[PDB]
């Protein structure tokens, strides 16, 4: 922006009503993010036209697995507001369920390295996969803490670190690394 | 489309409507669902900034409400509706809802239609 | 010294009272809920605890001098009757403060179990024991609620203070500095803006009058 | 008449009185009455802060210094008082601090005037 | 400051190029400090070569003990912070240490009347004296303290006042506390 | 003005120049109990002045009804909020006396339409009685307490309806229902 603001006039006439928006920080960018994107204010103003080919080339649970990941990523956002106020404190399951998983997606997936070619370069296969790997995880720690397991135990687990190590995997190996990770997800959850 | 709850508001809304010109009901109608829309944005995100070491049956009603206040009311797809046809919503979920919670619509217009 | 942006910032201080103004809204019956309840918790605490403590000292007093050794006697016999060293049922509880523990006053208590000392005051001072351990959980949970209301009294209080102080009026107060001197540099936009028409309306004049 | 000069600067008040030129206890009183109702409104701040107390035994004395400032010596309709009255009762309400060792005076005024 | 900050160019020339500085408050004016020095707003450069007429004329046991009066402050900032967040009923006996070695620092060292002209003009038979009383308390104190005697009866105790009178003293008054107060300090507070 | 700021001109002039602001809420408005005036946001630096010539004119004792009265609202303004959460039955009788006189208030000297034109007409001699019951029953409300009258009967006077039916009359029947009216307060504490 010009002014440092974005209220002027030449942001908003075709750098703000443009096909997509990403904001960004100074103390964003300098943790391991590079190139960033922020985790709230960034929003998609096109996106509901390139559903047809998403679903066709790529795969066809694909819109259904975008909208599911950002549903958290932005609505932890609520809690970022209850921070800067009065501050929660009061620890329940429910509640850092979504502190946790969140944290992990801001750590992990979107920390990239646009340096190496296993912390970014992205084909369909690796997309889809990593992308389905968070989701099922956090969807198995949603009825995992609904029966009385502390979010403790499942932060020490070693699927924690596997998340971890999909930053550092490449394209070509994808399909058999994530081929065998899916069973590391429901044994080391449905069991406890 | 997306609209806030006290934040929004016309200015002219009963001077242009009567009763029975988009049904006689209307008007105590058209100023529940401010007041009762307005109350789950309360807890619309506080249910466990609130723990489980307190939670009264009013309010967990009033989540509930928004859920399908949001789903169905607010937004009705770009199918076509009529006055008629987007009444019969705010009713019907009113109707979760005890008459001891209603307050904003008299007895009369609950003698038409719950 | 050290002073923040005023256009970058411009922007955030905006976005300050929308974090600030609806947030402070909902904190108020936030609060109001759990204290509402607890006040349940303290009147309904009296109800066994009346009743219970005048059938317990009812015997006790009555006996130390025929007895007073068979202390002994009944610890001995018992079977597992009083847990001297951590007995307690302990429970960990999450609230508003983090994990307090809590922890009522549950172990074996026994019901006429002595004997000596006084034929009728002995069976009795026995049977009173349950009128101990029962009671003394009424407030094993309504005093150590007392405690965790004690966290959230005093983070919730300082919030107030503060809000009424420093903060609403404060973040308000910076708007207007802020304003007020972006506004004012285009005073200088305007005089100097005045003058370069002057030069446009001049030159066209050293063509029309001189 | 409200009267708040918890952020005042009074540059000069030793000099155009003095002792004999107004009263005796003029320039000792003049410190004295400012920073002891200072810190009565100072405990009213740190109390709240942590729970609704932080008060001790050397703050109940101050602390009713702000009342005893308050609508006794503040409030007075539009009553003309002389600089006598004033100086002479303000040494009434410098009764309720243990005296001898102030923070401005010392022994010099204090079993002169109280 | 025309602005009430120095981002004005008339108010930055003294800040423009460096120098020394001084921080003069309106807060610290109202109770009638004279002078108003903060050192949260001042430095000097003069701290690195007065270095060498210290120790030629003044004394060598002066580049560090002027340094140690600093850091009594320096702490009492990190703590002020944390009194404003929670009162002095939530810190501990060390935590109320330097608070208030850092009230006598001010009430009777940040204050000089503007009634009594020998306080008006100091030596340096002034400085040393007083910086050196200060010294001794602290060194006693954190091992006074650790003996488990709390903050509170030490405020009770006719100790700290003597050391007080600082601010009513004239310059040939001057060895009337240099030596004598000097023992009563780390005399009769060990023991008592 | 856009906001209700003061930054802009128009109201920073205007609010010295002219010496009133009259502050309408939006939540006193929307019950429909009229006037909605907000009254810690109204003031009138007029009412000085003024004091003299009302009294001369309107009704001796008109000045001293509605400085007194006023007190009623300041101290249920704090007494609403969250001190009267566990109903007003938990608290002192002296703190209960507020609501009572409450009552009185809200449902008489603050309840009017713009619906109903025999209520909306007022002037002096109605509005002046209607203020002066309120006094007198604040007078005899603090000697129910002193005697331990119950707010169970106290709230289920006749005295009450009294008043309410005499809002519903412009003028006219207002005498005669000030002559009933008045000693029905008298008669109605000392019937009990």
Same mark, same amino acid.
């Given at each position: ?26 103390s ?26 998403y679903?066709?080339?790529?795969? +066809? ?12 990523? !932005?609505?932890?956002?609520?809690? #970022? ?35 190496? @070619? ?27 803490i ?11 687990? /070693? ?11 490449? +394209?070509? +190996? ?9 069973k590391?997800? #429901?044994? =080391?959850?449905?069991?406890? | 489309? $997306?609209?806030d ?32 829309y ?19 049956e ?12 949001? %789903?169905?009311?607010?937004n ?39 | ?16 009272? %929308? ?17 509402? @309840?607890?006040?349940?918790?303290? %009147? ?10 005048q059938?317990?000292?009812?015997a ?11 202390? /002994? ?5 018992? =079977? ?34 002595? $004997?000596?000392?006084? /034929? ?11 009128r ?5 959980? %009424?407030?094993?949970?309504? &005093?150590?609620?007392?405690?965790k ?14 809000? &009424? #102080? ?7 107060? !910076? ?28 030159? @066209?004049?050293?063509? +029309?009058?001189?």
């Amino acid at each position: 922006p010009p002014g440092g603001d974005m209220s002027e006039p030449v942001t908003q006439s075709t750098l703000r009503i443009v096909g997509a928006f990403w904001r960004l920080d100074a103390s964003l960018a300098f943790r391991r993010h590079f190139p960033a994107i922020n985790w709230n204010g960034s929003y998609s103003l096109f996106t509901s036209a390139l559903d047809p080919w998403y679903r066709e080339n790529v795969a +066809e649970d694909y819109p259904e697995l975008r909208d599911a990941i950002s549903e958290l990523l !932005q609505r932890e956002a609520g809690l #970022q507001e209850i921070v800067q106020l009065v501050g929660p404190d009061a620890l329940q399951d429910a509640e850092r369920l979504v502190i946790e998983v969140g944290r992990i997606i801001r750590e992990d997936f979107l920390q990239q390295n646009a340096y190496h @070619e296993v912390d970014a370069y992205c084909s369909m296969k690796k997309a889809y996969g990593i992308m389905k790997m968070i989701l099922a995880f956090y969807k198995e720690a949603e009825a995992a803490i609904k029966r009385g397991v502390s979010i403790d135990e499942i932060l020490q687990l /070693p699927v924690l670190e596997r998340i971890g190590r999909a930053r550092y995997v490449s +394209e070509e +190996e994808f399909p058999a690394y994530f081929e065998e990770a899916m069973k590391e997800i #429901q044994g =080391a959850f449905k069991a406890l | 489309p $997306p609209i806030d709850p006290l934040p929004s508001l016309s200015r002219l809304m009963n001077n242009g409507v009567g009763k029975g010109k988009t049904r006689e009901d209307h008007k105590q109608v058209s100023d529940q669902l401010y007041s009762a829309y307005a109350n789950g944005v309360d807890i619309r995100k506080l249910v466990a900034i609130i723990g489980e070491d307190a939670l009264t049956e009013n309010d967990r009603r009033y989540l509930q409400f928004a859920d399908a206040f949001e %789903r169905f009311f607010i937004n009705q797809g770009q199918q076509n509706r009529s006055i008629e046809e987007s009444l019969q919503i705010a009713w019907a979920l009113l109707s979760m809802l005890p008459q001891g919670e209603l307050k904003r619509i008299s007895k009369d217009h609950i003698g038409k239609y719950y | 010294s050290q002073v923040s942006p005023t256009r970058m910032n411009l922007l955030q201080r905006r976005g300050q009272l %929308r974090l600030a103004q609806k947030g402070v809204d909902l904190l108020k019956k936030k609060r109001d809920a759990l204290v509402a @309840e607890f006040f349940g918790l303290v %009147r309904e605490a009296m109800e066994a605890r009346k009743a219970l403590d005048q059938a317990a000292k009812e015997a006790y007093a009555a006996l130390l001098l025929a007895q007073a050794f068979d202390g /002994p006697e009944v610890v001995a016999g018992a =079977a597992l009757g009083v847990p001297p060293l951590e007995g307690v049922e302990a429970e960990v509880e999450n609230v508003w403060g983090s994990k307090v523990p809590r922890l009522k006053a549950t172990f074996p208590d026994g019901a006429l179990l002595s $004997p000596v000392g006084t /034929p009728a005051y002995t069976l009795e001072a026995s049977r009173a024991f349950r009128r101990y351990a029962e009671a003394l959980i %009424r407030v094993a949970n309504t &005093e150590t609620r007392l405690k965790k209301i004690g966290e959230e009294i005093k983070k919730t209080t300082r919030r107030v203070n503060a809000l &009424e #102080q420093v903060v609403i009026p404060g973040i308000r107060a !910076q708007i207007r500095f802020i304003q007020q001197v972006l506004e004012q540099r285009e005073r200088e936009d305007t005089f100097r803006l005045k003058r370069i028409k002057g030069k446009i309306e001049a030159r @066209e004049a050293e063509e +029309e009058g001189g």
